[PDB]
Ligand SMILES: CC(=O)N[C@@H]1[C@@H](O[C@@H]2O[C@@H](C)[C@H](O)[C@@H](O)[C@H]2O)[C@H](O)[C@@H](CO)O[C@H]1O
Ligand SMILES: CC(=O)N[C@@H]1[C@@H](O[C@@H]2O[C@@H](C)[C@H](O)[C@@H](O)[C@H]2O)[C@H](O)[C@@H](CO)O[C@H]1O
Ligand SMILES: Nc1ccn([C@@H]2O[C@H](COP(=O)(O)O)[C@@H](O)[C@H]2O)c(=O)n1
């Protein structure tokens with residue numbers, strides 16, 4: 001059985017922050033699941049149905065329906081208490097973002113004590129768990145898992161998303177976004193890797209539309225801004241922020257040569273009278289008119305690499321190791337492995353059968369084969385003609 | 391003679407960051423001044439005259455004219471080298487904001503070595519200095535000053551500004567914005583302090599217009615946002631940022647009860663579809679329609695206190711000690727002392743005669759007397775009827 005960990009702590013000021021993954025697992029569930037979460041994940045259906053998770057375009061794009069009493073009663077629930085969250089805040093001077101960073105990057109002994117108490121609250125629970133699944137890093141939970149002998153798959157929506165791309169997801173046994181294992185997996189297959197496809201072929205395989213035509217007018221430098229309170233910008237950012245990213249670029253380019261694109265999910269937008277503000281319908285059309293791209297650790301960085309743009313990546317993230325290679329050919333090879341073996345087809349990370357497949361730690365070849373099979377209806381060879389056939 | 395320190399390091403991506411204070415001291419100069427700055431402070435008049443310092447409304451409000459060759463040739467110049475700035479950046483992983491924070495809060499031995507070398511480059515220079523003046527904290531410079539036996543007045547525009555208020559300035563021997571001495575000065579006059587005026591009287595004395603009428607409609611909580619790369623938000627902020635300030639408030643109020651006002655000087659503005667976004671012509675009209683106010687350490691916080699609003703002050707700043715008092719009466723007394731003795735009438739901090747007056751460390755009574763005299767055309771008594779007469 002899966003034990004899916006969906007923390008209810010509203011670090012960013014919003015109840016049931018990870019509600020979409022709750023609804024996705026419930027909808028795809030083929031077995032009884034053990035949810036470790038908050039009661040907020042169960043009520044909210046009662047007066048804020050103006051949230052994006054309830055939007056029909058959200059549901060169609062992510063492929064889930066809303067649950068009912070029957071759908072939810074099929075599973076088991078362990079609910080965390082809010083009193084620990086209140087205590088956590090005061091231990092970080094009442095800063096919820098700081099507390100969020102601690103949650104992501106430090107063991108919290110009181111939380112380990114509660115998780116142990118909950119897992120033990122009913123006998124047989126622990127022995128039925130085949131793996132934990134967590135939507136974010138959590139050293140409290142990971143310490144608990146070591147003690148009980150259980151693995152932890154970290155899982156999230158990936159850097160390529162619909163409608164521009166095939167939906168992808170992350171699945172990492174060590175950590176998602178921060179502390180990933182993508183680099184280590186690649187360096188063991190670097191020996192026998194020679195992708196014959198070009199970078200554009202790789203990009204086109206995952207694009208649902210054709211890449212944009214030439215922009216005609218370009219800007220020397222593009223700046224990707226991100227969501228200010230995403231785990232990427234508060235814990236994995238090497239201390240960089242949007243404004244210091246801007247400053248970093250201003251050490252190199254005049255104002256006239258900087259094109260800035262705010263994140264559509266951010267609470268803030270750029271004012272007009274300072275920089276040239278991108279207005280493209282999507283980040284690829286913005287990338288298309290820049291000579292080089294600057295980011296902390298936004299998904300758009302991978303788009304920039306996949307289109308052959310010089311990219312600066314200031315924070316920690318899953319694809320950074322690709323940007324640290326010196327050549328276009330090493331880049332293609334690393335990129336192919338990242339797209340076809342590290343990234344998972346979105347629906348599969350919610351497929352209990354596929355999760356048990358990965359819990360057996362199969363060879364990379366087997367991993368790439370399963371993904372190519374889903375995308376379609378030697379590891380270099382599989383990819384090589386997978387691109388050609390497509 | 392004054393030795394005015396105006397660092398040229400473009401931490402925020404803009405040459406001659408402190409150019410207005412250069413122009414203000416040059417314009418008010420009644421003696422030869424020793425400027426320690428960059429050559430950028432001397433050229434920029436040559437293609438970015440679209441900066442606010444060149445705006446006629448800027449000049450009229452701050453009371454300076456542009457300098458010419460004659461005006462500038464009256465003084466002496468020691469220019470810092472850029473190679474140290476390049477080295478400083480790489481020592482902070484190329485993050486200019488982080489380097490800025492280090493500059494404000496750490497000794498930098500290479501900079502001390504350069505300042506010493508410059509001050510010694512011409513004999514007689516050091517012996518002619520009566521005090522350093524610095525527009526920001528700088529432990530490098532302060533260490534140098536200790537060695538040579540010189541004081542350091544930290545000086546800046548204050549929390550009350552034209553056109554809403556009489557212009558004020560800061561003058562602090564220990565530190566401006568961070569590490570101030572306003573609290574310590576107050577606690578030595580707390581004994582003999584009984585201001586009979588009300589809080590509204592104090593506020594009205596500094597207002598150039600009458601306070602706004604009642605708003606009719608209110609919001610439970612107002613959120614003051616600040617400029618992201620101001621020294622207040624990067625070094626004196628106790629790690630809080632705009633987005634975590636928002637999160638702090640969202641732990642207490644529903645979205646429907648939050649009114650947010652972005653800073654007019656910030657590069658970012660709020661999008662409309664999330665919170666109610668303030669549109670007031672000034673921060674007092676925004677304050678007027680809030681039941682309580684939340685800030686990191688914005689000047690607007692002092693406005694909120696002066697109007698009797700419950701205020702939360704999360705960062706370090708000059709007026710925090712006022713907010714830490716429990717009562718309205720202790721609050722008035724502390725507020726009166728802050729407005730009349732800690733804050734300086736703006737023009738005076740550029741008046742060499744007045745600076746020599748403060749370098750003699752006179753009694754608080756003498757300080758309050760000089761300021762009230764300027765504003766007009768026992769320490770409790772002086773203030774009491776200064777408010778009444780006005
Ligand atoms: C599916 C998707 O992209 N949703 C966006 C939200 O991001 C997702 O949900 C949050 C709760 C997690 O922290 C994210 O890592 C991600 O899984 C995003 O929060 C909002 C706006 O910021 O936009 C949605 O479209
Ligand atoms: C006089 C004034 O208020 N100017 C504003 C600028 O602030 C001043 O100049 C900068 C360089 C210092 O860092 C500040 O502490 C302050 O002295 C401000 O930078 C800009 C926009 O941010 O707006 C001016 O009006
Ligand atoms: N400045 C930005 C950042 C992200 N984005 C979009 O948001 C999605 C996720 O990007 P982050 O990883 O930066 O949150 C990207 O794939 C892209 O579609 C954008 O359109 N503009």
Ligand SMILES: Nc1ccn([C@@H]2O[C@H](COP(=O)(O)O)[C@@H](O)[C@H]2O)c(=O)n1
Nearest residue numbers: 614615616651652653654673688689690
């Ligand atoms: N959110 C904000 C912050 C500041 N301000 C204005 O900017 C001036 C300086 O405020 P900071 O100290 O926050 O930079 C204030 O006196 C006020 O006039 C504003 O109008 N809205």
Ligand code: NA
Nearest residue numbers: 204205207208
């Ligand atoms: Na395609």
Ligand code: NA
Nearest residue numbers: 323324325326
């Ligand atoms: Na590279």
Ligand code: NA
Nearest residue numbers: 594595597598
């Ligand atoms: Na008045």
Ligand code: NA
Nearest residue numbers: 713714715716
């Ligand atoms: Na108080």
